[PDB]
Design a protein around this ligand. Structure first.
Ligand SMILES: N[C@H](CNc1ncc(-c2ccc3c(c2)CC(=O)N3)s1)Cc1ccc(C(F)(F)F)cc1
Lengths: 19, 340
């Protein structure tokens, strides 16, 4: 599922702004 | 309410420009505050919970190392964030209480919000109910109406930049990416998942990028995850420009219609960027039960009230390693931050 995909994305934590 | 809103925004603009043209400076000194605990840290510096020694009031003090700001090529960004913060005034924008600098650092003493980061709450609960998400979304809408009237584009909307106060209302933070501009601009800035197509693409963009961001935010708050995600930013930009979006089955048809209008690639038809401006959004059926003035007046009962044990309690924050605040005997970057 999309949800399962999200939790396995490596980007569920605090996201930094791009530099 | 029309007349009253236009009237309100009129006064707001004049008060803003007065402070904008004559910014406040050196309104405190470091030794007036007792350092308590670090509330958050990263490339962006460090925010510490501090206590005014005499009043006992607690604040969130953002500390920036001049040398580092320069290394990061963020001189203008930092001077600009502070200029804006001392000029604006809205219930959902965190206030800058004091600001000053010393030989090595820059300091922004802001309102302290014990409730914590919206990010933490969202991930903890999974997803907010549509009414819960709508409450927050309404606050952002009003906030953007206010900022845009001042020709200010936020450019970094995301759960991570929103805090939940004592009454459970939203408080926006971080203006290191904001910009005052009438017309278009081109800078690549913000957070990957929240970038509008026109920011990713080389062409210029405008305040409409904030409205797209609102769409992403509403989606994440209601879904528990963003509409466009992947392992790497490069892949995220791919999905964003494609703009193809899928909605969870639990999303109401009205929520889906608003989002189709906010996450609109054709920035010529995106809600918030049309002839009727913000009102297209304020009058959309999803926001049908929303009492805009009462939200503005903070009379609406928050669907979620963060737990609170005191004005100096940090239980709703994460733990960081403490680091001494060093101040050189020699002035660094004087000329560069003279305006701070
Ligand atoms: N992009 C952000 C970093 N950039 C900042 N610029 C000004 C900031 C700020 C402003 C006011 C207050 C606080 C932080 C705390 C408070 O209570 N009042 S954070 C992301 C971020 C958001 C919030 C926190 C936290 F520190 F964990 F909350 C850490 C990281």
């Amino acid at each position: 599922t999309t949800y399962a995909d999200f939790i396995a994305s490596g980007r569920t934590g605090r996201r930094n702004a791009i530099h | 309410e029309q007349e009253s809103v236009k009237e309100f925004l009129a006064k707001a603009k004049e008060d803003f420009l007065k402070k904008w043209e004559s910014p406040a400076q050196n309104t405190a000194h470091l030794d007036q505050f007792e350092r308590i605990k670090t509330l958050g840290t990263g490339s962006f510096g460090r925010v510490m919970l501090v206590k005014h020694k005499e009043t006992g009031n607690h604040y969130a003090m953002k500390i920036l190392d001049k040398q580092k700001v320069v290394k990061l090529k963020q001189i203008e960004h930092t001077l600009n964030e502070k200029r804006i913060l001392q000029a604006v005034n809205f219930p959902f924008l965190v206030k800058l209480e004091f600001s000053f600098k010393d030989n090595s650092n820059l300091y922004m003493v802001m309102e302290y919000v014990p409730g914590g980061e919206m990010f933490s709450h969202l991930r903890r609960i999974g997803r907010f109910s549509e009414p819960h998400a709508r409450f927050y979304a309404a606050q952002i809408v009003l906030t953007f109406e206010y900022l845009h009237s001042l020709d200010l584009i936020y450019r970094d909307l995301k759960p991570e930049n929103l805090l939940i106060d004592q009454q459970g209302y939203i408080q926006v933070t971080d203006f290191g990416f904001a910009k005052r501009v009438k017309g278009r601009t081109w800078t690549l800035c913000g957070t990957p998942e929240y970038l509008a197509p026109e920011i990713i693409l080389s062409k210029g963009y405008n305040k409409a990028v904030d409205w797209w961001a609102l769409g992403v935010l509403i989606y994440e708050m209601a879904a528990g995850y963003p509409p466009f995600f992947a392992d790497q930013p490069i892949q995220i930009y791919e999905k964003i420009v494609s703009g193809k979006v899928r909605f969870p089955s639990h999303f109401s048809s009205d929520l889906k219609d608003l989002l189709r209008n906010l996450l609109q690639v054709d920035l010529t038809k995106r809600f918030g960027n049309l002839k009727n401006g913000v009102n297209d959004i304020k009058n959309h059926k999803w926001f049908a039960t929303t009492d805009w003035i009462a939200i503005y007046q903070r009379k609406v009962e928050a669907p979620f009230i963060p737990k609170f044990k005191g004005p100096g309690d940090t239980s709703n924050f994460d733990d960081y390693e403490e680091e001494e605040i060093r101040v050189s005997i020699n002035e660094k970057c004087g000329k560069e931050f003279s305006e701070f």
